Design a protein around this ligand. Structure first.
Ligand SMILES: CNc1ncnc2c(C)n[nH]c12
Ligand SMILES: [Cl-]
Ligand SMILES: [Cl-]
Length: 148
């Protein structure tokens, strides 16, 4: 048995990227930036955690059909940073991450996990910074960890 992920202090978000280059840049430099509303959501979760648990980010390129890895938020959002460092000049700010898992996990492995906070929709049909309920997040993380 693996009862590791089966922990009450942690919050988990879906991150969608239109750009594969932005994924590569995030992995190389351990940074990210979301939309205005996404940054606001992630910053609030990180700050309210107060280091009592992780904020996990489940990354997936839009249209790719798979998740590509898992990172932990590692700083609050700095909203005043160099512009234009990502593929599109649509993002304002920066925060630190730590990629802890880089591997492709097909949507077929995850699509039976549904989000009660998003109309029972499959977790694989989420938009950027959709939050995942912790009990569903534990199921997702266990599947990502054990996929081969
Ligand atoms: C740098 N951050 C990003 N890059 C490309 N796409 C997205 C989305 C949909 N949210 N944040 C994104
Ligand atoms: Cl699908
Ligand atoms: Cl999206």
């Amino acid at each position: 048995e693996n009862l590791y992920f089966q922990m009450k202090h942690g919050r988990v978000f879906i991150i969608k990227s239109y750009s594969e280059d932005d994924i590569h840049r995030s992995i190389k430099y351990n940074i990210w930036c979301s939309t205005e509303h996404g940054n606001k959501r992630l910053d609030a979760a990180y700050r309210s955690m107060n280091g009592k648990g992780p904020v996990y980010l489940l990354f997936s390129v839009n249209g790719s059909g798979h998740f590509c890895g898992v990172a932990e938020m590692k700083s609050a959002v700095d909203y005043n940073t160099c512009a234009g460092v990502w593929s599109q000049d649509k993002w304002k700010g920066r925060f630190d991450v730590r990629w802890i898992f880089v591997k492709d996990v097909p949507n077929s492995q995850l699509r039976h996990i549904r989000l009660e906070n998003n109309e029972n929709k499959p977790v694989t049909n989420s938009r950027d910074t959709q939050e995942v309920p912790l009990e569903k997040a534990k199921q997702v993380l266990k599947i990502i960890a054990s996929y081969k």
